[PDB]
Amino acid sequence: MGPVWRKHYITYRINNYTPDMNREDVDYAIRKAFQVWSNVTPLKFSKINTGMADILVVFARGAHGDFHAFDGKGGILAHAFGPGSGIGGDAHFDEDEFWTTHSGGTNLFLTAVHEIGHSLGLGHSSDPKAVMFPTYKYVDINTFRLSADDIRGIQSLYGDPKE
Ligand SMILES: O=C(O)C[C@@H](O)CCc1ccc(-c2ccccc2)cc1
Ligand SMILES: [Ca+2]
Ligand SMILES: [Zn+2]
Ligand SMILES: [Zn+2]
Numbered sequence: 001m002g003p004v005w006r007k008h009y010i011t012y013r014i015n016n017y018t019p020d021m022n023r024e025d026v027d028y029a030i031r032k033a034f035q036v037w038s039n040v041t042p043l044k045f046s047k048i049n050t051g052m053a054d055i056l057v058v059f060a061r062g063a064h065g066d067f068h069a070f071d072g073k074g075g076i077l078a079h080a081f082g083p084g085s086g087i088g089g090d091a092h093f094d095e096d097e098f099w100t101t102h103s104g105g106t107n108l109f110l111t112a113v114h115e116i117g118h119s120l121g122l123g124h125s126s127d128p129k130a131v132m133f134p135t136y137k138y139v140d141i142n143t144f145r146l147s148a149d150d151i152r153g154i155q156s157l158y159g160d161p162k163e
Contacts, residue, residue, distance in 0.1 A: 003083045004121045004157050005054070009044045010089075013053035016060075018108075020099040026108065029101065030057060033112030036131075036144075037120060040151050041158040055119050057112075059095040070094040077136055078111050080118035091115040103138045110144070111136065117150070121157050125149050 012034065017026050027047070034045035063069035066087060068079060073096045080091040091112070098105035110131070117132050125132040127149040146154075 002121055002123075002157075003088075005043075005083045005089070008042050008158075009046065010055060011046050011048045011053045012055040012057055013048050013051075015056050015058040018059045018093070018095055018099045020105075021101055021108065025101045026099075029109040030112055033109055033116050036113050036146060037116055037154060039161075040146065041154055041160065042162055043120075043158055055089040055091065055116075058090060058092045059099075060092055061095040064092070066092070068092075070096060072096045073098070077106055078115050080115040082118060082121050089119045091119050102141065106136070107138055107141065109141055110139065113144075113146075117154070120154065122150075122153050125153070 038045055061070050077097050078093040081087050099108045113131050122132055124134045129147040130149045
């Protein structure tokens with residue numbers, strides 16, 4: 001067993017915004033990524049604009065103060081921290097990538113789903129169909145669906161949705 005969030009209502013805050021997409025699209029990509037996970041668990045996610053959030057969403061480049069500097073465009077696209085104190089739960093997105101609403105460059109939505117996965121306590125999957133698979137690969141975002149391995153992994157930590 002690993003650490004998990006100990007409450008079902010979780011807040012998130014977007015600390016800053018990439019200039020690559022407007023505010024609405026960043027908000028939307030992120031909201032929809034949390035929704036992928038709340039659809040298969042009892043978890044509820046909500047965006048806040050002031051105060052300390054459970055999960056902080058940050059865009060940053062190179063060294064940004066957590067001992068895991070980013071590596072410019074390509075390579076690692078983002079990273080996140082599992083349920084914990086302090087930094088616990090935050091999701092950082094390498095601002096040197098080029099973030100897009102679709103397949104223009106690095107899809108923000110798919111990346112967010114992957115990273116939120118980590119923020120929720122999940123690790124990597126060896127299943128090539130899983131969102132938690134270690135390698136980014138674009139998939140039509142209107143067709144996107146968690147894999148069975150993803151769902152079994154997240155339900156093992158939080159259970160399924162209630163009646
Ligand atoms: O491993 C990490 O958390 C650091 C990041 O560099 C990894 C980014 C990433 C982003 C999307 C995916 C993915 C995207 C679509 C479908 C399945 C997986 C996989 C991986
Ligand atoms: Ca990078
Ligand atoms: Zn970081
Ligand atoms: Zn990962």
